[PDB]
Enzyme design. Sequence first.
Site, PDB file in Angstrom:
ATOM      1  N   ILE A 141       2.579  -0.718   1.308  1.00 37.51           N
ATOM      2  CA  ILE A 141       1.602   0.387   1.164  1.00 37.51           C
ATOM      3  C   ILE A 141       2.446   1.676   1.069  1.00 37.51           C
ATOM      4  O   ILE A 141       3.410   1.839   1.823  1.00 37.51           O
ATOM      5  CB  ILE A 141       0.759   0.432   2.472  1.00 37.51           C
ATOM      6  CG1 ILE A 141      -0.265  -0.740   2.412  1.00 37.51           C
ATOM      7  CG2 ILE A 141       0.074   1.783   2.674  1.00 37.51           C
ATOM      8  CD1 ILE A 141      -1.017  -1.031   3.757  1.00 37.51           C
ATOM      9  N   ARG A 171       0.114 -12.116   1.931  1.00 40.12           N
ATOM     10  CA  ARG A 171       1.357 -12.910   1.750  1.00 40.12           C
ATOM     11  C   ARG A 171       1.305 -14.295   2.401  1.00 40.12           C
ATOM     12  O   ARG A 171       2.095 -15.177   1.955  1.00 40.12           O
ATOM     13  CB  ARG A 171       2.550 -12.152   2.392  1.00 40.12           C
ATOM     14  CG  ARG A 171       2.813 -10.829   1.736  1.00 40.12           C
ATOM     15  CD  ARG A 171       3.860 -10.041   2.506  1.00 40.12           C
ATOM     16  NE  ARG A 171       4.217  -8.794   1.821  1.00 40.12           N
ATOM     17  CZ  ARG A 171       4.581  -7.665   2.481  1.00 40.12           C
ATOM     18  NH1 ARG A 171       4.498  -7.632   3.817  1.00 40.12           N
ATOM     19  NH2 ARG A 171       4.987  -6.567   1.843  1.00 40.12           N
ATOM     20  N   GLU A 182      -0.065  -8.183   4.697  1.00 34.57           N
ATOM     21  CA  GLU A 182       0.493  -9.375   5.318  1.00 34.57           C
ATOM     22  C   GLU A 182      -0.378 -10.649   5.151  1.00 34.57           C
ATOM     23  O   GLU A 182      -0.006 -11.539   4.314  1.00 34.57           O
ATOM     24  CB  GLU A 182       0.676  -9.292   6.865  1.00 34.57           C
ATOM     25  CG  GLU A 182       1.867  -8.421   7.227  1.00 34.57           C
ATOM     26  CD  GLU A 182       3.147  -8.790   6.398  1.00 34.57           C
ATOM     27  OE1 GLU A 182       3.032  -9.545   5.385  1.00 34.57           O
ATOM     28  OE2 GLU A 182       4.087  -8.022   6.724  1.00 34.57           O
TER      29      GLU A 182
END
Length: 246
Positions: free
Chosen positions: A71, A163, A160
């Site tokens: 970000i 991912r 996260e």
Amino acid sequence: DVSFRLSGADPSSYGMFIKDLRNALPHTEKVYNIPLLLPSVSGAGRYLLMHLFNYDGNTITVAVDVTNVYIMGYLALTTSYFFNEPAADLASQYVFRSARRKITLPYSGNYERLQIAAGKPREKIPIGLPALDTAISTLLHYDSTAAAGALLVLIQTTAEAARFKYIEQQIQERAYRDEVPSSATISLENSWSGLSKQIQLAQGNNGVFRTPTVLVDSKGNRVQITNVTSNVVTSNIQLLLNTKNI
Ligand SMILES: OC[C@H]1O[C@H](O[C@H]2O[C@H](CO)[C@@H](O)[C@H](O)[C@H]2O)[C@H](O)[C@@H](O)[C@@H]1O
Ligand SMILES: *[C@@H]1O[C@H](CO)[C@@H](O)[C@H](O)[C@H]1NC(C)=O
């Protein structure tokens, strides 16, 4: 762009948002069936905008670098905020240029600097859908110490979870009650670069990591990942940081 609304949110609507977020990131190739993020993207197309809405319907737009899911900054009403790092300053040349004013936050975006600004490691900061609602709310008005903790929640519950499927499920389990991340969650965060590199180096090494990756498992047990048959590679990781960026 992708969007997520906290009002009426549940594990399913959160899972749809994390799916939209992964699907907005471009890739030309998969490596062991995992999308390989691009080495680079020029101009404005480098940045994905995530529109997030708190339970009251107030919103921030968050800018995410599509090559690494980092970000860069966010817009909240008429003010933009960016991390104090060159990649974020470059992003400020492309996104939220219509903001009446731009504040550079007094830290960069990495976990070590944010935890220092926040006053606490992220082992100690509860995450979940309620913590995400608070984080959006916090970011609506500037307070740089409150913002560092909100940003630790926002990074983990957004880029996260995109991912790692395990982290996405951890947040779904916290749809209505926050809880600090499991040590497995922290390990995977910390290992994403390392994993992404080893999975790529495996391509000409018969599926075998050139260097083993040490992770903590769901029982708090410390394991070694040595090759692409590990459940971390076949089930969990959803996006690979291109080795050109490592
Ligand atoms: O700027 C946002 C991203 O932060 C997360 O990772 C941060 O923490 C790392 C600290 O170990 C740094 O290496 C990295 O610069 C930071 O960005 C994560 O990488 C992304 O999902 C966030 O968008
Ligand atoms: C690869 O991974 C598994 C662990 O998940 C392990 O049991 C196995 O012995 C490893 N194979 C090779 C070729 O290193």
